[model samples]
Target: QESPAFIDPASWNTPFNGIAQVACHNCYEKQYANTFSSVLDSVRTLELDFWDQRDAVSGGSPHHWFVRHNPGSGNDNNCTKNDLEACLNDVKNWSDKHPGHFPITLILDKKQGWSKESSGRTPKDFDELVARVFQGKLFTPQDLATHIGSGAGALQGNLKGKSWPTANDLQGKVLLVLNHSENQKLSQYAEARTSKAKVFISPVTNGQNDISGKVSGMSSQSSGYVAMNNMGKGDKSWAKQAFAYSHIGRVWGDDEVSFAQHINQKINLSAYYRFAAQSAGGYRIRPF
Candidate 1:
C-alpha cells in the first residue's frame, strides 16, 4: 500500500513551531530545521559564555564576585545580597574542602550603628587580631628576603646567603600576604602575576580633587626609570610613563599631572633614578 506524502503547511514551517507554537507564522519545516541547526551552531560557538554564566550561578568565579561586590560606584554602600550570599557559601565550601588551611576566623560583624553605639568597649580591630593570631604562620624572614631580592643584582651581597621558601612549603596554602611597594618595579611585577598574593599599593594622592599643576616640578622621574628598566627586561613590553608635576592647564587640579611634570624634568637631566612600587593597593604610576 502506498502512503500519501505529508505536505508541510506554509504557516507552520518547523516541527518545533507546529508543536511548541500553536500557530506558525509563515514558517516552513525546512526553514525551521535550518534555524534549529543555526541555534545549535550558535550554542557551540558561545560555549564559554554559557560556562561563565553557569560559573556565576555556582559561585565559581571569584573575580566576577569581586567586581559585583566592589562596584565602586559613587560611594554606594549597599551590597548585592545574592553576591554576598554566594561569596559566603564559597568561603564555607572552601573551608570544608581544606580543613585548617586558613587559620583566620571569619566574623560577620553586622551591627547596625555599631560605630555610633560606642559603649566604652573598644572592639578588637581586625588587623590587630589577625596579627596576634597568625603571627608566625605567615611569611618568614627567608620568604621576605627572597621576594625583596627577586630581580637581577638584588641579591648581590648580604642576601646571597639567604634561603627561600620552596613551592612545597606553600602547597595547599589559602592566602599569602606580601608587603608590596608600588615604588619598586620588582614588587609591582610580582603583584601583577601572583594570584594568591595580596598586594597593598600605597596611595600618592589624598583624593580625586587634589591636583598638582606644573609639569617641571613633578617628582616622578624615579617611577619613569623603574618603568623603563622593567620594560628593558622584556622584549616589546613597556610600562606607561606618566608626569605628575606639570603646570599645564589640563592638570589644574590633578595631583598626577603635577607629579608627572616634576619627574619629566629629572628624566631629561638624569640618566638613572631609584624607583619603588607604592605599598598600598591600586596606585600604579601610569605615563601621560
Candidate 2:
C-alpha cells in the first residue's frame, strides 16, 4: 500500500521527460530528523541544503560544511542540523549498501550560488567531501557520451546544453546538482566549477514556503523554482516545467509543517499529477 497505486511498469523503462522525476528537498529538516533511510526506499532524487558551517571548536578544522540549513544546530545524531561530513557518510553508506543499479540525484543548495565562497567551504570542499564518501564514484559530463545505453535512443549523442541522464546511465554513481537562489544565482556556475558536479536544474517558479494549496502559475524557468516537494499542477506552462527540469521543497511553518507535516509528498503521484482536462497547451503526459 505504501507504493504508488497507479504507476505502470511498462512506462518504467520508457523515455519520459526529466520533469516526471521527483526529488525530496531538505530531507534532514523533517520532523523525524533521520528518516532518510525510510524515504530513500522509494524516492529517487534527494535535494539537500549544503550550508557553510565553520566554528572555533578546539582542534576542529576551522572550516567545514554542514548538511542542514543552520550550523551547530545538531551533532551527527541530530538529523535537522547534521554536520556535512556525517551527512556525506550517510549517503555513502547508503550507496555502498545498494548494488550499483539504482541512481540517486543530489540537488545541492549552497549559500553562495555555485561558486566557492570567500573563506567558506568551496565547491572544492563539496568535491572533497563527496569524494571521500562516494569513494570516487561520480557521474560527470564527460561520461555523458559514454553513459549512453539502449534506453536513451538518439537523445544520448545529441544533447542541447546540460544533459539529464536516464536512471540506467547514472547507476552506481552519485549525481550532484546545484540550486540557485535570487542573491546566489548560478549563471557562472560552470566557470566556477573546480569539480565534476553536474548542474541538475532547481526549477521552482511559484507557490513556495508552505502555502499548501494547488499551484497553477509556472515560473519562466526550471532549475524553474517550483513549490517545495510539489509538481506544479494544472496550468500548461507549469506542467512543462515539471517534465523538463526539477522540483524543490519549501519548508512550511518552520516549526511543525516543514518536517512532520510534509511527510512523503515526494512519491505521491497524485500530489503532482496535472489533470489533462485542466492543462494548458503543450503540457504532456497522460497518467490515468
Candidate 3:
C-alpha cells in the first residue's frame, strides 16, 4: 500500500504555535523570486544582510539600503537583487494576505556595523525608512512588554528577566531582530516610537552561527541547545535575552547522519528555529 498523504490544519502551517521557522539564506531573493510566492508563506522569519551603498558623487535622501550576501555578488535577477523598500513592501503585502498568520520576524544583519566608513547615510536614515515601510505594522518592545505583562522595565528594550510573549500575543505585527554585533546601534532608538522602527538586539552571550549539536559544557538553559529543557519547569530566565531564544540552524552538513543527529537533538520548544544554509537550500525545509 502507498503511504498516507499528510493532513494538517491551517494553524499548524504558521510560523508560530509550533516551532517558529526561519529562512537564513538568500531571503531577499526567495521572498518573491521565481514563483512570485514566498518561503515566508510558511516560515516566520527571513534573514537578510544589509550593506548600504552610496549614490556616488551626488548626495540623496537615504534610499540605497541594499540587501545582499556578499559585497561583490552580482545583482543578476529578482532573487539576487533587492532593496530595503522592496523587501519591506513584500513583507507588508504578505502580512496583509494572512491576518492570523503574522508577527513575521526579519533578521537584519547589518554588515557595516555602526561605523561611518561606508559612504551611505546613517542609521537614523535606515530607521526612518523602516518606520515609513512598517508604519503601525511594526511590533515594538513596548508591545512585547505589554503582551507578557513585564511592565515598564521591559519596555526599555532590555530582555533581561522578561517573559517571552506567545505567538497569539504577537499576531498582526512584524519584528526586527538586529544581529548581536549591532547591539550598540540599538541604543539610538526608543523601544516604542511613533515614527521610528523598534528593534530587538540579539544577546551577545548566545551561541553564534549554525547550531548542529550541543557542546559538552554548554548549559541546557542556554538559547541554542536544549533551551526549553528548563521551560517546562517554569524557568523564565531563558527568555531574558536581548532577542528571542534562537537556534541559528538545524544542521550544517549534507550527510544523512549529520541531518539525523541535528534533528534529533533536544528541542528548545521556544527557540526561534533557523534553517541557515548556503545556495538558499534552507528555504526547502518546511517546519510543519
Candidate 4:
C-alpha cells in the first residue's frame, strides 16, 4: 500500500509556526566529537562560547579565536577541540550537505578573561572567519533587514517593529545570534548575518518576573531565548517556560521580534515530544 507523504513542520510557511531545538550552555564542543549528531533530528541550533586568545593557532603566533565554555587554554595544542575555525568548518560542511533541511543557527557568545595582548588578528578577523567559511550560504543581517521591509528602502541599522523571518524562510542559510558588544559590532557589518541578543526567559515555576535581569542595552527588538534554568521546574514544563516568554511588545503592541528557544543543558525527552505536539497543532504562534 502506498502511504501519503509527510510534511515536516519545519517547512511551515508561517513565522514561529514550528519549533526549533537549540543547543544550550555551550554544549557544541563538549559533546561535539561524540553525541552532537546523534540528536540532530530535532536539534539544529549550536550555541558556542568564543574567546579571543593570544598566539593560539597551530604553526603560528597569530592571535586566534577559540570556542569553549570558558576562557580556553592560552596555548595552541587543542585546535581540533577548541578552534573557532575548525568549528565553523564543521558547520559549513553539514550545511552544504543538507542545504536548508534545517536552517542552522550558530549562537556565538563571547566569554570574558582573554588577556589584552597585541597580536596580528584584528577585530575583523573573527568576522572574517565566519564569512570565509560560510560565504554564499549565509542569510545575512542585510538580507533579514531588507526582507522584513518587503524590499522597500529599509536601513539595516535597525530591525525592530516587524515580524521575524520564519524558519522556512531561512532554509538552507546560516543565521548567527551573538551576545552583548559582539552583537553591536558584528551586526554593523554589511556581511553580518545575525540576531541581536540571547534573551533569557522566566522559569516555569517562578513565573515571568524572573526575566527582570534584562537590564542590559541589548534590545528585545531582536532576540532569541535561553529558556529556563534546570531547577526542576523545566524538567516538567519546559514548554510552559517557552510559552511563558512575553516580549516587551506585549504591553506596547507587538513591537518585539524573536526566534528560537535554546533549552537548558539537561536534555528533556518529554519537552522534545511536547514541542512536536505543539507544532502539530498548526497555529501561528506569536513571539510576544
TM-score of 4: 0.54
lDDT of 4 at 101: 54
Tens-digit lDDT string for candidate 4 (84-123): 6776677777667665455666656555322223554444
Which candidate should be chosen as best, given TM-score against the real structure? 3
Cα lDDT of model 3 by residue, 104-213, tens digit = 67766666534342544565556667777888788754455455454423333233334445455556778776652433343332222322336544432323211212
Model 3, position 209, has a per-residue lDDT of 19
Where in model 4 is the C-alpha error above 4 Å? 1-11, 16-22, 31-39, 54-63, 72-82, 113-122, 150-161, 180-288
Clashes of each: 49, 17, 0, 1
Clashing pairs in 3: none
Q: After superposition, how far is residue 196 of candidate 1 from its true place, in Å?
A: 19
lDDT of 2: 0.40
lDDT of 1 by residue, 101-184 (tens): 312112121111111113311122212322333444443223333554543212222232333232234322222221111224
TM-score per prediction, in order, is 0.23, 0.56, 0.57, 0.54
lDDT per model, in order? 0.21, 0.40, 0.42, 0.39
Among the numbered candidates, top lDDT falls to 3
Ranked by lDDT, the better of candidates 1 and 3 is 3
- Segments of candidate 3 deviating more than 4 angstroms: 1-22, 29-37, 54-63, 73-81, 115-120, 151-163, 180-197, 204-288
